[PDB]
Ligand binder design. Structure first.
Ligand SMILES: CC(C)[C@H](Sc1cc(Cl)c(Cl)cc1Cl)C(=O)O
Ligand SMILES: CC(C)[C@H](Sc1cc(Cl)c(Cl)cc1Cl)C(=O)O
Length: 133
C-alpha cells in the first residue's frame, strides 16, 4: 500500500517554467516546443514491489517499471540515456536521473486532489500539476 495515493490515471492541467527547465536539462529547440505542447496522461500502477509509470501523449508514449531504491537504466522522452533511482521520502516519490556528470530530480507528491510534480535542474524548477482523469 506504499504508493496507494499515487495510483491511477492522471492528466496534466497546468505547467510553469517547463521550457526553462528543459533548456537547463539540454533539450533542443524543436523538442522543447513539441514537448511543451504535450498534455500527457500519467498512469501509475503497482503490482507487488514493482511500480509502473506510463506516460501517453501526442509527443511520445513512455513506460518505466522499477522497484524503490533500485537503480535502472532509462531512455527519457527527450532521448537521454540516464541512470535513474526512485525512492519514497516522507510520502514524496523522488526520481533522480544521472547522465554525463549531470543530475536532475523530479518529485511527485499528492496535494489535495492533485498530483504535483516538481522538476529541478540546478537552480531551475518547474511545477506541473496533474488531476485525476
Ligand atoms: C515532469 C516532466 C519532466 C514530465 S514531461 C513529459 C514526460 C513524459 Cl514521460 C512524456 Cl511522454 C511527455 C512529457 Cl512532456 C512530466 O512527467 O510531466
Ligand atoms: C518525466 C520523466 C519520466 C523523464 S524526464 C523528462 C521528460 C521530458 Cl519529455 C523532458 Cl522535455 C524533460 C524531462 Cl527532464 C522522461 O521520461 O522524459
Amino acid at each position: 500500500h506504499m504508493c496507494d495515493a499515487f495510483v491511477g490515471t492522471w492528466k496534466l492541467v497546468s505547467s510553469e517554467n517547463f521550457d526553462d527547465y528543459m533548456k537547463e536539462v539540454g533539450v533542443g529547440f524543436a523538442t522543447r516546443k513539441v514537448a511543451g505542447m504535450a498534455k500527457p496522461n500519467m498512469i501509475i500502477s503497482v503490482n507487488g514491489d514493482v511500480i509502473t509509470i506510463k506516460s501517453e501523449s501526442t509527443f511520445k508514449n513512455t513506460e518505466i517499471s522499477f522497484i524503490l531504491g533500485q537503480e535502472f537504466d532509462e531512455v527519457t522522452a527527450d532521448d537521454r540515456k540516464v541512470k535513474s533511482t526512485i525512492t519514497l521520502d516522507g510520502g514524496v516519490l523522488v526520481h533522480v536521473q544521472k547522465w554525463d556528470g549531470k543530475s536532475t530530480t523530479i518529485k511527485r507528491k499528492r496535494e489535495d486532489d492533485k498530483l504535483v510534480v516538481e522538476c529541478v535542474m540546478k537552480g531551475v524548477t518547474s511545477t506541473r500539476v496533474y488531476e485525476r482523469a
